[PDB]
Amino acid sequence: CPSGATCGSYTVGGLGSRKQQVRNAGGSSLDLAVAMLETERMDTAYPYGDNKSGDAANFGIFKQNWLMLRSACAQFGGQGAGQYDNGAALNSSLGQDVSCLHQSQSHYGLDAWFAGHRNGASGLSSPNTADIAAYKAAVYWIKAQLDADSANLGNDTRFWVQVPA
């Protein structure tokens, strides 16, 4: 486990089939790690926008925020913060979700992407915080578990890390 955190793994029914769908939609192991951290079932069943509005609203299985989406992704080009409900298109289309993730990561580079993903504009402007570093470490710990045994790319196991610890 990273730092002083608890971590572990448990079984989620149907998750292996879902992992395969994410991969077939273009998700890499890093993308799977992010998805695995963000929701239990790699879905969009969390509250709409993750109970946030505007630039802070989250959409899709990676919980991408509207600032990131409208700043980097062609389908949201030129849109303002108040148009955030348009990001809900990612809740219905896994292919668009992955496409947007890749556009955003390429636009910012991965290091900046982690910062903006975690903390929005504040994160992009101050990307080297301890909290952002903890988030990144959690994702890469999950990825290490996926990398260490390829069965984890298609089985029902969810790896988890308590990011606040």
Q: What distance in Å separates the CA atoms of residue 44 and residue 124, rounded to the nearest whole number?
A: 25
Q: Min. distance of Cβ 104 from Cl ion in angstroms?
A: 6
> Of the two residues 18 and 63, which places its CB atom closer to Cl ion in the complex?
63
> Of the two residues 15 and 61, which places its CB atom closer to Cl ion in the complex?
61
Q: Is 136 in the site for Cl ion (CB under 5 A)?
A: no
DSSP classification of residue 124: H
Q: Is 64 in the site for Cl ion (CB under 5 A)?
A: yes
Alpha-carbon torsion, ordered 138, 123, 62, 56, to 10 deg: 140
Q: Is 117 in the site for Cl ion (CB under 5 A)?
A: yes
The single residue among 61, 68, 100, 139 that binds Cl ion, judged by CB under 5 A, is 68
β-bridge mates for residue 158, sequence order: 10
* Sequence-ordered strand ranges (E) for the chain: 7-11, 58-59, 64-65, 157-161
Q: List the one residue out of 62, 61, 64 whose CA is nearest residue 43.
A: 61
> Site size for Cl ion, by CB under 5 A?
4
Query: Which segment (8-16, 83-91, 115-123, 125-133) binds Cl ion by CB under 5 A?
Result: 115-123
Q: List the one residue out of 77, 73, 93, 75 whose CA is nearest residue 25.
A: 93
> Of the two residues 7 and 25, which places its CB atom closer to Cl ion in the complex?
25
> Of the two residues 7 and 89, which places its CB atom closer to Cl ion in the complex?
89
Per-residue binding string, Cl ion, 4-43, x by CB under 5 A, is ----------------------------------------
Phi, psi dihedral angles at 161 (to 5 degrees): -140, 135
Q: What distance in Å separates the CA atoms of residue 134 and residue 91, rounded to the nearest whole number?
A: 27
Q: Is 71 in the site for Cl ion (CB under 5 A)?
A: no
> Of the two residues 33 and 68, which places its CB atom closer to Cl ion in the complex?
68
Binding site residues, Cl ion, CB under 5 A: 64-65, 68, 117
